[PDB]
Design goal:
Belongs to the PI3K p85 subunit family. By secondary structure, the protein is mainly beta. It contains two helices and five strands. About 10% of the residues lie in helices and about 40% in strands. It has a five-stranded antiparallel β-sheet with strand order 4-3-2-1-5.
Length: about 80
């Protein structure tokens, strides 16, 4: 399984409770399935600003939730592996 990774370029304080805080440098991983379900074919994952809101796992803080695509940069794919 593989996810798409993004890095936070700006700080963000959650508005809604399903949002997550972003801190400069935080690494986020979004499961491909969630993007596929939104019809995000082609390669829009490399343009999160264009996507709008993403839902993922903040690798740096351990929190899961929604975060704005205009606040991050796509850094590439990551293969998820079992523990």
């Amino acid at each position: 399984a593989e996810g798409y990774q993004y890095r936070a370029l700006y700080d963000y304080k959650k508005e809604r409770e399903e949002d997550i805080d972003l801190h400069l440098g935080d690494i986020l991983t979004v499961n491909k399935g969630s993007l596929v379900a939104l019809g995000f074919s082609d390669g829009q994952e490399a343009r999160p600003e264009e996507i709008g809101w993403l839902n993922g796992y903040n690798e740096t803080t351990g929190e899961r939730g929604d975060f704005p695509g205009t606040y991050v940069e796509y850094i590439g794919r990551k293969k998820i592996s079992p523990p």
